[PDB]
């Protein structure tokens, strides 16, 4: 409906796939080449379904910070026959707060879903389902089951992936450019 939704749509239409694990369906953001991200609680194994196609996992790494604290991001390299558009130039270099973000989801259940979540706080520490987690972004929107893996954007930046909620607030794991340097 406006420039925020325009940027979100441009990311969803070329840089997302539907990922299925034994823990359900997730929005999955493709970053460059065959490299994508997903919340670590999706529990990626040796095989994953990508748009309902059986796909070998070539590598999967659950990221932690240098304090050895969970970041809730898993980086996955997929044995897929096609590369993602390279969007690494849209990733922020540092931890930050943001205004006027959009959370965008695409699953079998919730296709073409876009939510204006408003102001995003650099929350930092969160006990997420019992697990100490760092680099958490928070927004004041009552996010629900089915939105995990959803992409958080501002105009011109891809800043995080949705990883949880408490009924009143939603929480995203930061994406930083340094996670995807090669």
UniProtKB/Swiss-Prot annotation:
Residues in Peptidase C3 domain copies = 2-180
Active-site positions, per UniProt? 41 (for protease 3c activity), 72 (for protease 3c activity), 148 (for protease 3c activity)
Q: Which reaction does it catalyse?
A: Selective cleavage of Gln-|-Gly bond in the poliovirus polyprotein. In other picornavirus reactions Glu may be substituted for Gln, and Ser or Thr for Gly
Location of this chain's protein in the cell = Host cytoplasm
Q: Which residues form the signal peptide?
A: none
Task: Give a short account of what the protein does.
Answer: Major viral protease that mediates proteolytic processing of the polyprotein. Cleaves host EIF5B, contributing to host translation shutoff. Also cleaves host PABPC1, contributing to host translation shutoff. Binds and inhibits host IFIH1/MDA5, thereby inhibiting the type-I IFN production and the establishment of the antiviral state. Cleaves host MAP3K7/TAK1, resulting in inhibition of TRAF6-triggered NF-kappa-B induction. Cleaves host TICAM1; this interaction allows the virus to disrupt host TLR3 signaling. Cleaves host IRF7, resulting in inhibition of type-I IFN production.
**Subunit comment:** Interacts with host IFIH1/MDA5; this interaction inhibits host IFIH1.
Q: What is this protein called?
A: Protease 3C
Q: Which species is this UniProt entry from?
A: Human enterovirus D68 (EV68)
